Structures are given as C-alpha cells and as structure tokens.
Amino acid sequence: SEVRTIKVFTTVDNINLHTQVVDMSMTYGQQFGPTYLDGADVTKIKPHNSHEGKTFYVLPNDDTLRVEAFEYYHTTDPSFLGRYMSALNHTKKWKYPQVNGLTSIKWADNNCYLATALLTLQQIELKFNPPALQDAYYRARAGEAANFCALILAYCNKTVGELGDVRETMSYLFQHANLDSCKRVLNVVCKTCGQQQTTLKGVEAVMYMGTLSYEQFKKGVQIPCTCGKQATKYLVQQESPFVMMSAPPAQYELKHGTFTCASEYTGNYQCGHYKHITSKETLYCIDGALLTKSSEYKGPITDVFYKENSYTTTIK
Ligand SMILES: CC(=O)NCc1ccc(-c2cccc([C@@H](C)NC(=O)c3cc(NC4CNC4)ccc3C)c2)s1
Ligand SMILES: [Zn+2]
C-alpha cells in the first residue's frame, strides 16, 4: 500500500546524534543494519509510531561513525556495541540501591562481583581514559549505574549471568584508567645472589598477588628465587593513590581503620559468592542491597585495598 516515514536519530556514542528518515514498512535491519533501542535489538522489527524522535544505536558502517565510536569507547572491536547493548538490555532491569552512601546492585545474574567492583571504585581515586567509562561512571556514582555495568561487561568480554573474578574485572578497568604517574620500587634479597631492585609503572605498580597484608609486603614476603634458596621481596617505594593486595581466599581478620575496603569470597573456584567489607566509623559488610555492621571481622578475604600517596621504606 502507501509509504509512511518517521524521523529518528542514529548514534554510536549517544553524544553525536544523526537525523535519519525511516520507512514504517521496512525493518530497521534492512535500512541501517543492526539497530538497538535502549539495548533491545530492533533489527528485525518495523518502526512503530512511538519511535518518532527517539535515539537508536547502530554499528559504525561509515568512517565518520568509526572515528566517533573509537574516540568514545577506545576500541575497534566490531562486536563491542552488540555486547554493550546485549548487556544493557539486562542491566537496565537491575536495581541500584544507595547502601552506606555508595551505589550497590541488588543481587541478580551473578552480579555479586560487579556490585563489589562498583562499591570499590567509589572508594579509590581513578580517572578512566575512554569518555564512555568517564560518563557512565559519573552517572553510576549518582545511582544511575545501568550503563557503567553494561560497559564493564562489554570491556571484560563477560556474559550476563556468568560469575566474574573481582581481581580480573579490576585489572581490565585499570588498563583503561590513567595510572601513568603510578610507580613502585621492589628489592629482592638473597643470602648469596644479592640485592636486585625493580621498578613497576601503571597497573603493575598498584596490584600484587600472594599476600593481602600491605604491612607484610613492606616487612618482606618469601618467594621462590631462581637459584633455589627462598628470597625476600619487600616494598622500597610506592607512588599511587591506592594499592590492591590480592591472594587466594583465606581466613583473614580485618580491623577498623587499617584498610579502605576488602573482597570476601565464600565457596569454590568459579562458583562462589562475593561480599564487600568497607572501613568507615565501624566495619560495614555490603552484600548487594543487604547491609550489616560489626566492630570486628574474620572471613575468607581475597582482595584488600589501601589508600596511599608516597611510602618510602626505612629498611637498609
Ligand atoms: C575446598 C576449599 O577449602 N576451598 C576452595 C578453593 C580453591 C581455590 C580457590 C580460589 C583461587 C583463586 C581465586 C579465587 C576467587 C577469588 N576467584 C574465583 O573463584 C573466580 C575465577 C574466575 N575465572 C578465572 C579466569 N580468571 C580466573 C571467575 C570467577 C571467579 C569467582 C578462588 S577457592
Ligand atoms: Zn637467590
């Protein structure tokens, strides 16, 4: 029969909108290629009357859109938008309650580790490079974290419903944050082999696997030396706003005011449950929407975060 149209906007970044005219007889797919509205796939759907003036997301099919996409997300992975939108379709349905003055996530689709990562980021000093993470993270801090979670999932190449590692998640995010000015100096000491000194910049300057205790890392930790005689690695100098100390879950006692926040993991490798412990006027345990408060804490801790500016050892 007749040809009806509506006006809509197409975007890759929801910053630069592009006025398009669509035909209400043809599917979005046929006219634009893959097309999303609020993360919902509409490729196979014909325009509705209500669609007038709404913003749709499309894949970058021309060079103008490729520049706009790369500038915003800092990636040229063709699958990225599809994944960002697939995630978003789920993450818009999650509830983000304000818990202890911080945005959490009400438990759903094994998001316990995203919730824990989100509560953590709010407590440490981080500047993201991708304008996509800068923007979503600002809105997350406000209670509006639907997009930030969908982006974490997209960057970390994760499915909705699949349980993630908080330390793997955080590493990925730190790869997309400005940490150029972060600097760590380690000394490794043997009885024979002598004192070797290394310097670590960026992600490797703020992350350590093998001890939870920041104080222990400064005193010294035992490591298997190449020679075969256990050597002592100790921290000589740290320049970072924070440090992340990680180790495989173990009964650990956390004391008020000796740490910033910690990741509790109960259960078995890849199928457990995450809780967030934070240190304020007392110890808070944030379990999605659920909050409890205690003087003391012992439990299976796997990540502890500490605030820092400049530490310099007095050793030697
Ligand atoms: C029987 C008993 O006493 N304890 C059981 C355990 C043995 C080992 C454990 C362990 C070891 C390391 C880390 C942990 C915790 C902190 N991490 C995860 O489980 C983990 C890992 C992955 N994906 C792998 C690819 N990137 C790592 C995905 C999701 C999760 C929750 C856990 S827990
Ligand atoms: Zn040695």
UniProtKB/Swiss-Prot annotation:
Effect of residue 233 to Q: In strain: Gamma/P.1
First and last residues of each zinc finger (C4-type): 190-227
Residues annotated as binding Zn(2+) 4: 190, 193, 225, 227
Catalysed reaction equations from the record: Thiol-dependent hydrolysis of ester, thioester, amide, peptide and isopeptide bonds formed by the C-terminal Gly of ubiquitin (a 76-residue protein attached to proteins as an intracellular targeting signal)
Cell compartments where the protein resides: Host endoplasmic reticulum membrane
Record's subunit section: May form homohexamers. Interacts with N protein.
Protein name: Papain-like protease nsp3
Cited function: Responsible for the cleavages located at the N-terminus of the replicase polyprotein. Participates together with nsp4 in the assembly of virally-induced cytoplasmic double-membrane vesicles necessary for viral replication. Antagonizes innate immune induction of type I interferon by blocking the phosphorylation, dimerization and subsequent nuclear translocation of host IRF3. Also prevents host NF-kappa-B signaling. In addition, PL-PRO possesses a deubiquitinating/deISGylating activity and processes both 'Lys-48'- and 'Lys-63'-linked polyubiquitin chains from cellular substrates.
Consequence of changing residue 5 to I: In strain: Kappa/B.1.617.1
Active site: 112 (for pl-pro activity), 273 (for pl-pro activity), 287 (for pl-pro activity)
Segments forming domain Ubiquitin-like: 3-58
